[PDB]
Amino acid sequence: LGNLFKSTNFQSGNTDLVILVTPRVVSAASLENIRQVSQAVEMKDEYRNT
Amino acid sequence: LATPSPFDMEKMVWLDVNILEIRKSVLENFGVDWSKQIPGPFAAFGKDFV
User: Fold this and answer.
1) Distance between CA A22 and CA A17 in Å, rounded?
2) Record: contact B20-A46, CB cut-off 8 A
């Protein structure tokens, strides 16, 4: 019953953050470059089909 | 007695650059927005003893 004679203000929250990196010695034929090249091909095909 | 050439014929390089970008977005706003702060009850008293 005391809530009829009382007012409450409540705040709560949290933030999570991670930053991580990965270096690799590559060439133009390396897997890291090939995947990005193939991603661009799919981007062009998706544009063409709309 | 030998003399140099006026300039050296360099090699020519062709550069091909491709930039691709795709953006997508959604926006939703649905429901009923009620009032959250309303007036409460009141009471007053007044008297003249003398």
Assistant:
1) 17
2) no
Distance CA A48, CA A39 (A): 14
A44 Cβ contact partners less than 8 Å away, ≥ 6 residues apart: B20
Q: Do B18 and A40 touch (CB under 8 A)?
A: yes
Tell me the resolution in Å.
Answer: 2.4
Query: Which amino acid makes up residue A32?
Result: E
**Radius of gyration for chain A, computed over Cα atoms and rounded to the nearest angstrom:** 26
Disruptive mutation site among A37, A42, A43, A48 for chain B (greatest number of B CBs within 10 Å): A43
